[PDB]
């Protein structure tokens with residue numbers, strides 16, 4: 001009745017971590033990305049697969065799902081997640097060697113806010129509400145059209161042993177006051193992380209011939225691979241937030257972005273902006 005071509009050619013490894021590996025692959029001419037999970041991180045494959053079996057997300061700013069594959073081997077199980085392939089790589093990668101103008105900076109951050117609001121908001125008929133729980137510049141891909149998409153739903157929570165990246169954890173995560181039975185708590189953790197990403201991008205926007213070098217959030221106050229305690233002392237005890245450079249206050253776009261990131265960083269989670277309010281504010285800038 002029909003051939004089911006499942007052969008995927010793995011062409012090039014574009015990522016190797018504790019999570020496993022990501023490969024550029026080829027299926028029937030078409031480029032795909034293949035994430036091969038470490039045994040260490042099998043539950044991330046299970047959770048992303050469980051979510052996509054619940055709701056087939058389709059959004060321009062969400063990394064496009066193609067397939068979840070489990071294959072029996074000699075004495076192990078092999079777990080692959082297959083997605084769209086974005087050749088320009090992660091936003092983290094992209095910001096290292098690219099500077100931005102006003103239009104590209106706004107297009108990047110509004111596309112992220114768009115993907116995040118899509119995750120957050122319940123649609124009746126639709127989709128459950130979803131919080132990401134590990135938003136960061138390495139989990140955002142740059143598309144050829146200048147918009148981004150959000151990747152990695154391995155920690156996602158839905159409403160109707162992995163933890164987040166410590167550098168991006170909100171204060172209520174670090175001080176363990178987060179209300180774990182409350183879905184809105186998880187949206188507010190994502191908004192904190194979004195504000196840090198907005199800071200990382202805004203630094204690379206040129207104004208009056210000036211730009212900042214790429215740095216990760218809190219680069220000046222914590223070590224590489226900061227401990228939970230290192231982060232708690234900065235974010236909770238001292239209540240530090242990323243520096244806004246003086247040069248931003250000469251530029252109307254960066255002045256508006258600095259205000260937006262402040263309103264993502266309130267100690268009180270319920271004071272933080274919503275993803276929908278961030279979108280509206282971004283559409284009114286420039």
Ligand SMILES: COc1cc(-c2cncc(-c3ccc(C4CCN(C)CC4)cc3)c2C)cc(OC)c1OC
Nearest residue numbers: 002003004005006007008027032066067068069082
């Ligand atoms: C099993 O595994 C993999 C399968 C595929 C794949 C390859 N050719 C054809 C298909 C196909 C899709 C959909 C239908 C429809 C036909 C109409 N009917 C009303 C319902 C069913 C049939 C066939 C698939 C799904 C690709 C893979 O990788 C990209 C796979 O591995 C992950």
Ligand SMILES: COc1cc(-c2cncc(-c3ccc(C4CCN(C)CC4)cc3)c2C)cc(OC)c1OC
Nearest residue numbers: 003004005027028030031032065066067082083084
């Ligand atoms: C998983 O991913 C990819 C899959 C395919 C693909 C291969 N064979 C058959 C199909 C197909 C045909 C028909 C139906 C429907 C149509 C009508 N409906 C009312 C019931 C049945 C569904 C599916 C697809 C979609 C191609 C892809 O790319 C070109 C894929 O992406 C990499």
Ligand SMILES: COc1cc(-c2cncc(-c3ccc(C4CCN(C)CC4)cc3)c2C)cc(OC)c1OC
Nearest residue numbers: 014022033034035081083085086089138139151152
């Ligand atoms: C964040 O996480 C996931 C990411 C991806 C993914 C999707 N498109 C493209 C990529 C990629 C391609 C190329 C480069 C480099 C190599 C070539 N050049 C020298 C510089 C650029 C980097 C990255 C990735 C890593 C897929 C995933 O799942 C299958 C991910 O996990 C959910």
